Nucleic acid binder design. Structure first.
Length: 167
RNA sequence: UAUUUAUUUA
């Protein structure tokens, strides 16, 4: 992209001043906004930062993505143009073979579009995959196509079909 | 089985 970034997985405890201070350390900011619930005013876990110089947005991604704050590992990337088309593109998947890795899950789902995020849930105790997870596509239409082409199907070597639905 | 609960901001 260019100068506008979206920062995800922000700690519930982080303040906008800390937000601006952390990203302000990279370079001049034209504006930034820790997103908050319109009624409660509490942080929603993410925010945006728009740099003056695109080279700084690049440096922000290169240096701050993966930074661990409190219980979070923040993610820094380019904000896609705000559009209703990117909303509601998150899927809930179950029945996956527990042998499946996240790399394989994305390879499976990527046939239908650009993946923004993927996550396979694991058991705290045994540590074994639970065969469930989430996949968020770039476009709602891509998620709809994945539901149609993957719900009730059996992946590559699977013996059991999987369920795909909007989160 | 709902995520590092929560990726598009008067």
């Amino acid at each position: 992209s260019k100068t506008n970034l979206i920062v995800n997985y922000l700690p519930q405890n982080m303040t906008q001043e800390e937000f601006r201070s952390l990203f302000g350390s990279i370079g001049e900011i034209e504006s930034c906004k820790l997103v908050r619930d319109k009624i409660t005013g509490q942080s929603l876990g993410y925010g945006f930062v728009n740099y003056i110089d695109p080279k700084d947005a690049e440096k922000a991604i290169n240096t701050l993505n993966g930074l661990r704050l409190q219980t979070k590992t923040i993610k820094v990337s380019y904000a896609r143009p705000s559009s209703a088309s990117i909303r509601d593109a998150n899927l809930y998947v179950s029945g996956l073979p527990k042998t499946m890795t996240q790399k394989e899950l994305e390879q499976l789902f990527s046939q239908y579009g650009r993946i923004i995020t993927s996550r396979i849930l694991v058991d705290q105790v045994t540590g074994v995959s639970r065969g469930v997870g989430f996949i968020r596509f770039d476009k709602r239409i891509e998620a709809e196509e994945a539901i149609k082409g993957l719900n009730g199907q059996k992946p590559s070597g699977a013996t059991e079909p999987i369920t795909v639905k909007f989160a």
